[PDB]
Structure 1
């Protein structure tokens, strides 16, 4: 019901995991660009994992503890050899800050969440994370 962003480019193909009950972990694969994200989450009594955007890079796992929620997403998007992709990507929880991951500067974006949380993702993916957006909940 509340979907924000898609920051990135038009390349790759669409993904959309919808909202979750709880995000368990977010694993950003990155080298000089953001290659991919794995999200594992619970959904109506089940645990699920998705992986958006290609093989590539080194993994950086954010694991969410008991009362921990994603309250921020930040990054940069730009042209990496002909595709507009997320060159840098970071997250913050109520407890700590992570990243950003990736080494390619571009047009910055930032989503601080003064009230609410990130409950899921949508965007575009191919060889790399072309774009990323976020579902929000109270």
Structure 2
């Protein structure tokens, strides 16, 4: 299985949501900085939820359809009052293109998947979403 990343800092303890059969929705909580993310997905028969990061920020739901896939991830990670975190996080599907969300510029990164799909998340979480990473599969 393929993992790229993670982009960001080192704060907090790690997470590894593992590959899903299909991502159903990603909800991104952001303010100044990207606080957190919610991923709902099917998993070997079971509809399953995980939350990544801390509380608060305004949420924005990315809802994935039948044909709709996570095909790209762009964001900027910077240093926010003493802590290196995801300042802006954005996603794109084969149908639309979301965000990015968050108001703290920094060192950017883009991950455009020309062939394949994002199907997982592994990273590090704190009071804000410290660093995010992706499981890739075709």
For the criterion TM > 0.5, the same-fold answer is yes
Stretches of 4+ moved more than 6 A in 1? none
The normalised TM-score by structure 2 is: 0.99
d(CA) in 1 for partners of 2:101, 2:119: 20
Q: What displacement does 1:65 show?
A: 0.6
Deviation at 1:66, TM superposition (A): 1.0
Distance 1:24 1:52 in 2: 16
Aligned to 1:47: 47
Return the offset for 1:56.
1.7
Shift of 1:135: 0.2
1:134, CA displacement in angstroms?
A: 0.1
**Cα distance in 2, alignment partners of residues 55 and 90 from structure 1:** 19
Deviation at 1:123, TM superposition (A): 0.2
* Matching residue of 2:83: 83
For structure 1, which runs of at least 5 residues remain unmatched after alignment?
A: none
| In structure 2, distance between residues paired with 1:102 and 1:40 | 21
Distance 2:32 2:61 in 1: 17
Q: Deviations over 1:107-136 (max 9, x none)?
A: 000000000000010000010000000000
Is there any run of 5+ residues in structure 2 with no aligned partner, and where? none
RMSD value over aligned CA atoms?
A: 0.4
> 1:69: which partner in 2?
69
